[PDB]
Symmetry: C4
Subunit: 92 residues, 4 copies
């Protein structure tokens, strides 16, 4: 029972939905490719493509500053939840 | 204005991004918007789909990376703790 | 063996990298060494020069990123504090 | 006077030298491009190329695990030293 995790999850999903909508409508990517671009951008993995429109470039700059902190907060909380069963099985 | 460290990191981040925009548009021939995009994705460690083509560009980018990552991520951290986190919390209050 | 959290993160990291090696060599057709390279650069956030071409590959990679980054960086942190830092310190002692 | 910073600097330079030597001899890159590859790898910015030899791929995997922590420790210490004059000029 972790409302902090639940809220971070919601915020992450909503942020990825917004990017998917944006890149699929403004940059003309298939939904899966718009989601992929959004994910590799906010996780800092990085893309092998870039936006073609000035609007898309500006959006991506702002999207990084809006979303990078949240995404890494979520990744951290996710890691705690995913590794804890193994830690506890190896402890008590 | 309450957190002076945040104020400094913000100004330094803006100046760093202006410097990169000027550099890449002059030396690497990018349009200013593409030079700003390149600077942002580089200093946040996202990475661009392109890379510098000139030796000057490569050397500058190495130095810009080392100095710039620390500042931009210091700014992102302060933005998260001083702006985004309080805004999220406020927006979760039932009214 | 003294730090059980480090032990768990190490094993989980190895299993995660084996899973990626198997996945990318089967679904994306990469040689195993290229699948391992891709998995490593992806989960450390370095990023590859390539990207998945199949929709299965794209979906898997999104999930692998979210689960894998946290584990691999947990491992890197533990490796730094429990192995690399004590080794550096020991190697700086005049004898 | 910061021996911690001095040591991190030395370790970083030696690590970048080793990568420059490796990628310029094994992967046939010009020195500047071997240094660039080493830097964007350890800082996690990422490269638009990859090693062509199996030896180079294996080396890069190990190089990441050997060097990423040190490089980020250095980047942090560098940031403290670079921003402190501005903070202090804005304070005392
Ligand atoms: Cl178990
Ligand atoms: Cl422009
Ligand atoms: Cl192979
Ligand atoms: Cl001053
Ligand atoms: K990338
Ligand atoms: K690329
Ligand atoms: K483009
Ligand atoms: K990239
Ligand atoms: K990165
Ligand atoms: K890359
Ligand atoms: K990257
Ligand atoms: K990159
Ligand atoms: K290659």
């Amino acid at each position: 029972k972790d409302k902090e995790f639940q809220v971070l999850f919601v915020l992450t999903i909503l942020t990825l939905i917004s990017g998917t909508i944006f890149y699929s409508t403004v940059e003309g990517l298939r939904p899966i490719d718009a989601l992929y671009f959004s994910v590799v951008t906010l996780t800092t993995v990085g893309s092998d493509i870039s936006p073609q429109t000035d609007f898309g470039k500006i959006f991506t700059i702002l999207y990084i500053f809006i979303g990078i902190g949240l995404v890494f907060g979520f990744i951290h909380k996710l890691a705690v939840n995913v590794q804890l069963p193994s830690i506890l099985s190896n402890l008590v």
